[PDB]
Design a protein around this ligand. Structure first.
Ligand code: FAD
Length: 447
Protein backbone atom coordinates (compact mmCIF):
# COMPACT_ATOMS: atom_id res chain seq x y z
CA UNK A 1 0.00 0.00 0.00
CA UNK A 2 1.79 3.10 -1.19
CA UNK A 3 0.57 6.39 0.34
CA UNK A 4 1.76 9.79 -0.89
CA UNK A 5 1.53 12.72 1.49
CA UNK A 6 1.80 16.29 0.14
CA UNK A 7 3.28 18.91 2.45
CA UNK A 8 5.76 18.84 5.34
CA UNK A 9 3.91 21.32 7.58
CA UNK A 10 1.41 20.45 10.39
CA UNK A 11 -1.24 18.58 8.35
CA UNK A 12 1.16 16.52 6.22
CA UNK A 13 3.54 15.78 9.08
CA UNK A 14 0.87 14.28 11.38
CA UNK A 15 -0.54 12.15 8.57
CA UNK A 16 2.98 10.62 8.22
CA UNK A 17 3.16 10.03 12.01
CA UNK A 18 -0.21 8.28 12.13
CA UNK A 19 0.71 6.20 9.04
CA UNK A 20 3.87 5.06 10.83
CA UNK A 21 1.99 3.75 13.84
CA UNK A 22 -1.12 2.44 12.01
CA UNK A 23 0.36 1.17 8.75
CA UNK A 24 4.08 0.49 9.49
CA UNK A 25 4.17 -1.76 6.43
CA UNK A 26 3.21 0.97 3.97
CA UNK A 27 5.48 2.54 1.39
CA UNK A 28 5.25 6.25 2.31
CA UNK A 29 6.42 9.14 0.16
CA UNK A 30 6.45 12.65 1.67
CA UNK A 31 6.76 15.59 -0.76
CA UNK A 32 7.79 19.18 -0.05
CA UNK A 33 8.34 21.78 -2.79
CA UNK A 34 10.43 23.90 -0.48
CA UNK A 35 13.97 23.49 0.58
CA UNK A 36 13.34 23.14 4.34
CA UNK A 37 11.28 20.39 6.02
CA UNK A 38 8.82 21.37 8.78
CA UNK A 39 9.81 24.97 9.64
CA UNK A 40 7.56 26.21 12.47
CA UNK A 41 6.16 29.61 11.38
CA UNK A 42 4.32 29.69 14.75
CA UNK A 43 7.82 30.15 16.36
CA UNK A 44 8.76 33.14 14.15
CA UNK A 45 8.00 35.76 16.82
CA UNK A 46 10.32 34.09 19.37
CA UNK A 47 13.11 34.21 16.75
CA UNK A 48 12.37 37.87 15.75
CA UNK A 49 12.47 38.94 19.39
CA UNK A 50 15.84 37.17 19.91
CA UNK A 51 14.56 34.52 22.28
CA UNK A 52 15.74 31.87 19.84
CA UNK A 53 19.01 32.69 18.04
CA UNK A 54 19.18 29.97 15.41
CA UNK A 55 16.48 30.11 12.72
CA UNK A 56 17.20 26.54 11.65
CA UNK A 57 16.25 25.12 15.03
CA UNK A 58 12.65 26.52 14.76
CA UNK A 59 11.30 23.27 13.46
CA UNK A 60 9.89 19.97 14.63
CA UNK A 61 11.19 17.37 12.13
CA UNK A 62 14.00 16.86 9.63
CA UNK A 63 14.08 14.82 6.40
CA UNK A 64 17.03 12.83 7.84
CA UNK A 65 15.07 11.68 10.88
CA UNK A 66 12.07 10.57 8.79
CA UNK A 67 14.28 8.66 6.35
CA UNK A 68 15.72 6.76 9.35
CA UNK A 69 12.13 5.62 9.95
CA UNK A 70 11.75 4.32 6.41
CA UNK A 71 9.86 7.27 4.88
CA UNK A 72 10.87 8.46 1.36
CA UNK A 73 11.28 12.25 1.73
CA UNK A 74 11.40 14.41 -1.42
CA UNK A 75 12.27 18.04 -0.69
CA UNK A 76 12.51 20.56 -3.56
CA UNK A 77 9.91 18.47 -5.38
CA UNK A 78 6.51 19.83 -6.30
CA UNK A 79 3.32 17.88 -7.01
CA UNK A 80 2.16 19.64 -10.08
CA UNK A 81 -1.12 17.80 -10.84
CA UNK A 82 -3.30 14.96 -9.64
CA UNK A 83 -4.93 12.48 -12.02
CA UNK A 84 -7.53 11.06 -9.53
CA UNK A 85 -9.10 8.25 -11.63
CA UNK A 86 -5.88 6.54 -12.65
CA UNK A 87 -4.43 7.30 -9.18
CA UNK A 88 -1.34 9.14 -10.37
CA UNK A 89 0.32 12.48 -9.60
CA UNK A 90 2.90 14.26 -11.75
CA UNK A 91 5.85 15.54 -9.76
CA UNK A 92 8.58 17.98 -10.70
CA UNK A 93 12.04 17.97 -9.19
CA UNK A 94 12.65 21.68 -8.87
CA UNK A 95 16.49 21.45 -8.91
CA UNK A 96 16.79 19.34 -12.13
CA UNK A 97 13.55 20.31 -13.90
CA UNK A 98 12.69 16.59 -14.37
CA UNK A 99 9.00 15.65 -14.40
CA UNK A 100 7.79 12.13 -13.72
CA UNK A 101 4.41 10.49 -12.98
CA UNK A 102 4.06 8.56 -9.69
CA UNK A 103 1.21 6.11 -8.83
CA UNK A 104 -0.41 5.82 -5.39
CA UNK A 105 -2.98 3.72 -3.60
CA UNK A 106 -3.97 6.57 -1.24
CA UNK A 107 -3.13 10.31 -1.41
CA UNK A 108 -3.35 12.80 1.52
CA UNK A 109 -2.76 16.47 0.58
CA UNK A 110 -2.21 19.35 2.98
CA UNK A 111 -1.38 22.18 0.48
CA UNK A 112 -1.95 25.00 2.97
CA UNK A 113 -2.30 28.66 2.35
CA UNK A 114 -0.32 31.57 0.93
CA UNK A 115 -0.18 35.21 2.30
CA UNK A 116 -2.83 37.47 0.76
CA UNK A 117 -1.28 40.52 -1.00
CA UNK A 118 -2.83 43.91 -1.75
CA UNK A 119 -3.06 44.32 -5.51
CA UNK A 120 -2.68 48.06 -5.49
CA UNK A 121 -0.37 50.65 -7.19
CA UNK A 122 3.10 50.38 -5.73
CA UNK A 123 2.38 46.62 -5.22
CA UNK A 124 5.99 45.70 -5.17
CA UNK A 125 8.26 48.49 -4.46
CA UNK A 126 11.13 47.10 -2.35
CA UNK A 127 10.54 46.52 1.39
CA UNK A 128 6.96 45.35 1.32
CA UNK A 129 7.30 42.05 3.16
CA UNK A 130 5.11 39.04 3.98
CA UNK A 131 5.15 36.81 7.10
CA UNK A 132 5.08 33.07 6.48
CA UNK A 133 7.95 30.55 6.25
CA UNK A 134 11.72 30.50 6.69
CA UNK A 135 12.77 32.93 3.95
CA UNK A 136 10.47 35.69 5.16
CA UNK A 137 11.55 35.04 8.80
CA UNK A 138 15.19 35.68 7.86
CA UNK A 139 14.47 38.85 5.84
CA UNK A 140 12.24 40.27 8.63
CA UNK A 141 15.02 39.61 11.19
CA UNK A 142 17.62 41.45 9.09
CA UNK A 143 15.28 44.51 9.05
CA UNK A 144 14.98 44.45 12.85
CA UNK A 145 18.61 45.70 13.13
CA UNK A 146 18.75 47.86 10.01
CA UNK A 147 19.52 51.51 11.01
CA UNK A 148 17.74 52.82 7.88
CA UNK A 149 14.41 51.34 9.09
CA UNK A 150 12.76 53.86 11.36
CA UNK A 151 9.03 53.61 10.56
CA UNK A 152 7.32 50.29 9.85
CA UNK A 153 3.69 49.96 8.90
CA UNK A 154 1.92 46.59 9.25
CA UNK A 155 -1.37 46.17 7.44
CA UNK A 156 -3.71 43.82 9.28
CA UNK A 157 -4.54 43.86 13.00
CA UNK A 158 -5.14 40.16 13.48
CA UNK A 159 -2.94 37.65 15.29
CA UNK A 160 0.00 37.72 12.83
CA UNK A 161 -0.11 41.53 12.42
CA UNK A 162 0.08 42.15 16.19
CA UNK A 163 3.01 39.65 16.48
CA UNK A 164 4.93 41.62 13.82
CA UNK A 165 3.99 44.97 15.46
CA UNK A 166 5.25 43.80 18.87
CA UNK A 167 8.50 42.38 17.42
CA UNK A 168 9.42 45.65 15.60
CA UNK A 169 8.34 47.86 18.57
CA UNK A 170 10.66 45.82 20.82
CA UNK A 171 13.47 46.30 18.26
CA UNK A 172 13.11 50.08 18.83
CA UNK A 173 11.14 50.99 15.66
CA UNK A 174 8.11 53.26 15.35
CA UNK A 175 5.14 51.07 14.31
CA UNK A 176 1.74 51.96 12.81
CA UNK A 177 -0.89 49.16 12.43
CA UNK A 178 -3.57 49.90 9.76
CA UNK A 179 -6.79 47.98 9.17
CA UNK A 180 -10.36 48.43 7.91
CA UNK A 181 -11.78 46.70 11.03
CA UNK A 182 -12.48 48.87 14.05
CA UNK A 183 -10.70 46.93 16.81
CA UNK A 184 -7.38 44.98 16.67
CA UNK A 185 -7.80 41.21 17.37
CA UNK A 186 -11.60 41.41 17.07
CA UNK A 187 -11.81 37.87 15.68
CA UNK A 188 -10.41 36.60 18.96
CA UNK A 189 -11.50 39.04 21.64
CA UNK A 190 -14.39 41.34 22.47
CA UNK A 191 -14.18 45.10 23.05
CA UNK A 192 -13.57 45.15 26.81
CA UNK A 193 -10.39 43.10 26.18
CA UNK A 194 -9.17 44.92 23.04
CA UNK A 195 -9.66 48.33 24.71
CA UNK A 196 -7.09 47.35 27.37
CA UNK A 197 -4.73 45.89 24.77
CA UNK A 198 -4.91 49.04 22.58
CA UNK A 199 -3.76 51.14 25.54
CA UNK A 200 -0.91 48.70 26.23
CA UNK A 201 0.26 48.83 22.57
CA UNK A 202 0.04 52.64 22.40
CA UNK A 203 2.17 52.82 25.58
CA UNK A 204 4.84 50.97 23.61
CA UNK A 205 4.68 53.35 20.59
CA UNK A 206 2.48 51.43 18.28
CA UNK A 207 -0.16 53.66 16.67
CA UNK A 208 -3.33 51.80 15.66
CA UNK A 209 -5.11 53.37 12.66
CA UNK A 210 -8.52 51.65 12.41
CA UNK A 211 -11.26 52.00 9.83
CA UNK A 212 -8.92 52.95 6.93
CA UNK A 213 -8.59 51.38 3.47
CA UNK A 214 -5.07 51.30 2.00
CA UNK A 215 -5.12 52.70 -1.53
CA UNK A 216 -1.52 52.70 -2.76
CA UNK A 217 2.11 52.50 -1.80
CA UNK A 218 4.30 55.41 -2.86
CA UNK A 219 8.05 55.46 -3.22
CA UNK A 220 11.01 55.60 -5.53
CA UNK A 221 12.27 52.04 -6.11
CA UNK A 222 11.43 51.14 -2.47
CA UNK A 223 8.44 52.04 -0.34
CA UNK A 224 8.35 55.42 1.32
CA UNK A 225 4.62 56.09 2.00
CA UNK A 226 1.44 54.06 2.53
CA UNK A 227 -1.64 56.16 1.68
CA UNK A 228 -5.12 55.23 2.81
CA UNK A 229 -8.44 56.88 1.98
CA UNK A 230 -7.95 59.07 5.09
CA UNK A 231 -4.19 59.53 5.58
CA UNK A 232 -0.57 59.05 4.44
CA UNK A 233 1.96 57.25 6.64
CA UNK A 234 5.74 57.24 6.28
CA UNK A 235 7.10 53.75 5.86
CA UNK A 236 10.57 52.33 5.53
CA UNK A 237 9.16 48.77 5.67
CA UNK A 238 5.61 47.42 5.28
CA UNK A 239 4.57 44.00 6.62
CA UNK A 240 1.35 42.83 4.89
CA UNK A 241 -0.58 40.60 7.28
CA UNK A 242 -4.07 40.92 5.88
CA UNK A 243 -4.95 37.23 5.71
CA UNK A 244 -4.28 34.03 3.79
CA UNK A 245 -5.46 32.49 0.41
CA UNK A 246 -5.87 28.62 0.05
CA UNK A 247 -3.15 27.13 -2.15
CA UNK A 248 -5.68 25.35 -4.43
CA UNK A 249 -5.85 27.12 -7.85
CA UNK A 250 -3.92 24.15 -9.33
CA UNK A 251 -6.71 21.84 -8.13
CA UNK A 252 -9.45 23.65 -10.06
CA UNK A 253 -11.12 21.11 -12.31
CA UNK A 254 -9.60 18.16 -10.40
CA UNK A 255 -11.30 18.27 -6.99
CA UNK A 256 -14.50 20.02 -5.93
CA UNK A 257 -13.74 23.37 -4.34
CA UNK A 258 -15.90 25.89 -2.54
CA UNK A 259 -16.38 29.40 -4.17
CA UNK A 260 -13.65 30.81 -1.92
CA UNK A 261 -11.09 28.19 -3.04
CA UNK A 262 -11.32 25.84 0.01
CA UNK A 263 -11.33 22.08 -0.74
CA UNK A 264 -14.67 20.33 -0.11
CA UNK A 265 -14.23 17.45 2.36
CA UNK A 266 -16.61 15.43 4.55
CA UNK A 267 -16.21 14.44 8.22
CA UNK A 268 -13.80 11.63 7.30
CA UNK A 269 -11.45 14.10 5.44
CA UNK A 270 -12.41 12.62 2.03
CA UNK A 271 -12.53 14.91 -1.00
CA UNK A 272 -14.93 14.53 -3.96
CA UNK A 273 -12.59 11.90 -5.50
CA UNK A 274 -11.93 8.27 -4.42
CA UNK A 275 -8.82 7.75 -2.31
CA UNK A 276 -7.70 11.38 -1.96
CA UNK A 277 -8.05 13.07 1.40
CA UNK A 278 -7.37 16.76 2.22
CA UNK A 279 -6.41 18.40 5.50
CA UNK A 280 -5.33 21.71 7.13
CA UNK A 281 -5.69 25.42 6.26
CA UNK A 282 -7.07 24.58 2.81
CA UNK A 283 -10.25 22.97 4.32
CA UNK A 284 -13.28 23.69 6.57
CA UNK A 285 -13.54 21.96 9.97
CA UNK A 286 -16.49 20.97 12.22
CA UNK A 287 -17.03 23.81 14.68
CA UNK A 288 -18.89 22.47 17.72
CA UNK A 289 -20.05 25.83 19.39
CA UNK A 290 -22.38 26.39 16.42
CA UNK A 291 -22.66 22.92 14.84
CA UNK A 292 -21.43 24.11 11.45
CA UNK A 293 -18.25 23.93 9.29
CA UNK A 294 -15.91 26.95 9.48
CA UNK A 295 -12.39 27.58 8.16
CA UNK A 296 -10.17 27.97 11.29
CA UNK A 297 -6.61 28.12 10.16
CA UNK A 298 -4.69 26.81 13.22
CA UNK A 299 -1.86 24.32 13.64
CA UNK A 300 -3.88 22.33 16.23
CA UNK A 301 -6.64 21.75 13.70
CA UNK A 302 -4.34 20.66 10.88
CA UNK A 303 -2.58 18.13 13.17
CA UNK A 304 -5.84 16.51 14.31
CA UNK A 305 -7.27 16.36 10.78
CA UNK A 306 -4.01 14.79 9.48
CA UNK A 307 -4.37 11.87 11.94
CA UNK A 308 -8.12 11.44 11.21
CA UNK A 309 -7.41 11.19 7.46
CA UNK A 310 -5.15 8.18 8.19
CA UNK A 311 -7.80 6.65 10.52
CA UNK A 312 -10.31 6.73 7.63
CA UNK A 313 -7.88 5.59 4.97
CA UNK A 314 -9.53 2.26 4.19
CA UNK A 315 -13.05 2.79 5.52
CA UNK A 316 -15.07 5.81 6.75
CA UNK A 317 -15.10 4.55 10.32
CA UNK A 318 -14.21 7.51 12.58
CA UNK A 319 -16.01 10.91 12.07
CA UNK A 320 -14.10 14.01 13.18
CA UNK A 321 -15.12 15.12 16.75
CA UNK A 322 -15.01 18.86 15.98
CA UNK A 323 -13.20 21.81 17.53
CA UNK A 324 -13.93 25.00 19.47
CA UNK A 325 -11.42 27.43 17.87
CA UNK A 326 -9.17 27.76 20.96
CA UNK A 327 -6.31 30.30 20.65
CA UNK A 328 -3.91 32.12 22.98
CA UNK A 329 -1.14 34.74 22.78
CA UNK A 330 0.88 37.17 24.90
CA UNK A 331 0.81 40.88 23.86
CA UNK A 332 3.54 42.73 25.84
CA UNK A 333 2.61 42.00 29.54
CA UNK A 334 -0.87 40.56 28.86
CA UNK A 335 -1.50 36.85 28.25
CA UNK A 336 -4.94 36.04 26.81
CA UNK A 337 -6.79 32.94 25.61
CA UNK A 338 -10.22 32.42 24.05
CA UNK A 339 -12.40 29.65 22.69
CA UNK A 340 -15.85 29.30 21.16
CA UNK A 341 -18.19 32.10 20.14
CA UNK A 342 -17.45 35.77 20.70
CA UNK A 343 -19.13 38.89 19.22
CA UNK A 344 -17.59 38.76 15.73
CA UNK A 345 -18.31 35.00 15.44
CA UNK A 346 -21.91 35.41 16.60
CA UNK A 347 -22.45 38.19 13.99
CA UNK A 348 -20.99 36.08 11.19
CA UNK A 349 -23.07 33.03 12.16
CA UNK A 350 -26.28 34.94 13.02
CA UNK A 351 -26.28 33.44 16.52
CA UNK A 352 -27.88 35.14 19.58
CA UNK A 353 -25.83 34.96 22.81
CA UNK A 354 -25.72 36.32 26.38
CA UNK A 355 -22.54 37.00 28.42
CA UNK A 356 -21.16 38.11 31.77
CA UNK A 357 -17.74 39.72 32.25
CA UNK A 358 -15.96 39.69 35.69
CA UNK A 359 -12.89 41.85 36.26
CA UNK A 360 -11.25 41.35 39.67
CA UNK A 361 -8.13 40.18 41.45
CA UNK A 362 -7.59 36.48 40.97
CA UNK A 363 -6.00 36.00 44.45
CA UNK A 364 -7.52 36.87 47.82
CA UNK A 365 -7.17 40.33 49.29
CA UNK A 366 -4.42 39.60 51.79
CA UNK A 367 -2.07 38.04 49.22
CA UNK A 368 0.43 40.66 47.89
CA UNK A 369 0.88 38.81 44.59
CA UNK A 370 -2.73 39.49 43.55
CA UNK A 371 -3.29 40.85 40.04
CA UNK A 372 -6.46 41.75 38.08
CA UNK A 373 -7.95 39.28 35.65
CA UNK A 374 -10.67 39.69 33.03
CA UNK A 375 -12.99 36.74 32.27
CA UNK A 376 -16.04 36.74 29.93
CA UNK A 377 -18.39 33.77 29.73
CA UNK A 378 -20.69 33.46 26.70
CA UNK A 379 -23.75 31.23 26.83
CA UNK A 380 -26.91 30.32 24.97
CA UNK A 381 -29.94 32.40 26.17
CA UNK A 382 -32.42 29.47 25.88
CA UNK A 383 -30.50 26.44 27.15
CA UNK A 384 -27.80 28.32 29.12
CA UNK A 385 -25.24 25.97 27.47
CA UNK A 386 -21.65 27.27 27.35
CA UNK A 387 -20.76 28.76 23.96
CA UNK A 388 -17.41 30.53 24.56
CA UNK A 389 -15.08 32.30 26.96
CA UNK A 390 -12.22 34.84 26.89
CA UNK A 391 -9.70 35.53 29.65
CA UNK A 392 -6.78 37.92 30.11
CA UNK A 393 -4.31 38.90 32.85
CA UNK A 394 -0.66 39.84 33.26
CA UNK A 395 -0.51 36.63 35.31
CA UNK A 396 -0.63 33.44 33.19
CA UNK A 397 -4.06 31.94 33.76
CA UNK A 398 -4.49 30.74 30.13
CA UNK A 399 -4.63 26.95 30.88
CA UNK A 400 -8.13 27.57 32.35
CA UNK A 401 -9.44 28.06 28.80
CA UNK A 402 -8.81 24.32 28.22
CA UNK A 403 -11.52 23.51 30.76
CA UNK A 404 -13.98 25.80 28.86
CA UNK A 405 -13.15 24.09 25.53
CA UNK A 406 -14.18 20.76 27.08
CA UNK A 407 -17.29 22.25 28.73
CA UNK A 408 -18.52 23.47 25.29
CA UNK A 409 -17.86 20.06 23.69
CA UNK A 410 -19.71 18.35 26.57
CA UNK A 411 -22.67 20.82 26.28
CA UNK A 412 -22.37 21.81 29.94
CA UNK A 413 -24.42 24.75 31.30
CA UNK A 414 -23.68 27.81 33.45
CA UNK A 415 -25.02 25.92 36.51
CA UNK A 416 -22.61 23.00 35.89
CA UNK A 417 -19.65 25.40 35.85
CA UNK A 418 -20.88 27.48 38.81
CA UNK A 419 -20.51 24.43 41.09
CA UNK A 420 -17.78 22.47 39.27
CA UNK A 421 -15.00 21.18 41.51
CA UNK A 422 -11.86 23.25 40.92
CA UNK A 423 -9.10 23.14 43.57
CA UNK A 424 -8.38 25.99 45.96
CA UNK A 425 -5.10 26.91 47.57
CA UNK A 426 -4.54 30.64 48.29
CA UNK A 427 -1.18 30.94 46.50
CA UNK A 428 -2.97 29.93 43.28
CA UNK A 429 -6.58 31.18 43.33
CA UNK A 430 -9.73 32.06 45.37
CA UNK A 431 -12.24 29.53 46.95
CA UNK A 432 -14.47 30.05 43.88
CA UNK A 433 -11.96 30.24 41.04
CA UNK A 434 -12.16 32.46 37.91
CA UNK A 435 -14.49 30.02 36.05
CA UNK A 436 -16.76 29.42 39.10
CA UNK A 437 -17.08 33.16 39.76
CA UNK A 438 -18.22 34.16 36.25
CA UNK A 439 -20.68 31.22 36.06
CA UNK A 440 -22.09 32.20 39.50
CA UNK A 441 -22.67 35.70 38.10
CA UNK A 442 -24.48 34.23 35.08
CA UNK A 443 -26.71 32.08 37.37
CA UNK A 444 -27.72 35.29 39.22
CA UNK A 445 -28.41 37.05 35.84
CA UNK A 446 -30.81 34.23 34.92
CA UNK A 447 -32.68 33.87 38.20
C1 FAD B 1 3.27 33.82 11.59
C2 FAD B 1 2.35 32.63 11.90
C3 FAD B 1 2.09 32.31 13.24
C4 FAD B 1 1.22 31.26 13.55
N1 FAD B 1 1.03 30.93 14.86
C5 FAD B 1 0.23 29.92 15.23
C6 FAD B 1 0.11 29.56 16.57
O1 FAD B 1 0.83 30.13 17.42
N2 FAD B 1 -0.72 28.52 16.94
C7 FAD B 1 -1.44 27.83 15.95
O2 FAD B 1 -2.20 26.91 16.27
N3 FAD B 1 -1.31 28.18 14.67
C8 FAD B 1 -0.50 29.18 14.27
N4 FAD B 1 -0.33 29.51 12.90
C9 FAD B 1 -1.12 28.81 11.86
C10 FAD B 1 -0.45 27.49 11.43
O3 FAD B 1 0.92 27.77 11.16
C11 FAD B 1 -1.18 26.89 10.22
O4 FAD B 1 -2.54 26.70 10.56
C12 FAD B 1 -0.57 25.53 9.80
O5 FAD B 1 0.79 25.69 9.41
C13 FAD B 1 -1.33 24.91 8.62
O6 FAD B 1 -0.69 23.72 8.18
P1 FAD B 1 -0.96 23.15 6.70
O7 FAD B 1 -0.25 21.85 6.59
O8 FAD B 1 -2.42 23.17 6.46
O9 FAD B 1 -0.35 24.23 5.69
P2 FAD B 1 0.96 25.15 5.50
O10 FAD B 1 1.57 25.45 6.81
O11 FAD B 1 0.55 26.29 4.64
O12 FAD B 1 2.02 24.24 4.70
C14 FAD B 1 1.77 23.70 3.40
C15 FAD B 1 3.08 23.06 2.98
O13 FAD B 1 2.91 22.24 1.80
C16 FAD B 1 3.85 22.67 0.80
N5 FAD B 1 3.25 22.54 -0.55
C17 FAD B 1 2.21 23.24 -1.01
N6 FAD B 1 1.87 22.85 -2.25
C18 FAD B 1 2.73 21.89 -2.54
C19 FAD B 1 2.88 21.10 -3.60
N7 FAD B 1 2.07 21.27 -4.64
N8 FAD B 1 3.82 20.14 -3.66
C20 FAD B 1 4.64 19.92 -2.64
N9 FAD B 1 4.56 20.70 -1.56
C21 FAD B 1 3.63 21.66 -1.48
C22 FAD B 1 4.19 24.10 1.15
O14 FAD B 1 5.51 24.45 0.70
C23 FAD B 1 4.12 24.11 2.66
O15 FAD B 1 5.39 23.75 3.23
C24 FAD B 1 0.58 30.54 12.56
C25 FAD B 1 0.85 30.88 11.19
C26 FAD B 1 1.73 31.90 10.89
C27 FAD B 1 2.06 32.20 9.42
Amino acid sequence: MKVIVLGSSHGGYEAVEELLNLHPDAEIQWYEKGDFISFLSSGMQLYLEGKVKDVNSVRYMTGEKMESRGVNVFSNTEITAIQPKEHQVTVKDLVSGEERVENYDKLIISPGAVPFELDIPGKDLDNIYLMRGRQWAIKLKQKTVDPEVNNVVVIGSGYIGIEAAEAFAKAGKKVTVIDILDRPLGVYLDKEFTDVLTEEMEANNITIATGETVERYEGDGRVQKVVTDKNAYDADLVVVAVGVRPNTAWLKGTLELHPNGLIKTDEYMRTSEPDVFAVGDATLIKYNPADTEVNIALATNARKQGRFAVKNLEEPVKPFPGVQGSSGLAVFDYKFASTGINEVMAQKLGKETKAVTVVEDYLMDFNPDKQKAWFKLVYDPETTQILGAQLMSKADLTANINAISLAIQAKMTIEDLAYADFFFQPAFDKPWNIINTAALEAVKQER
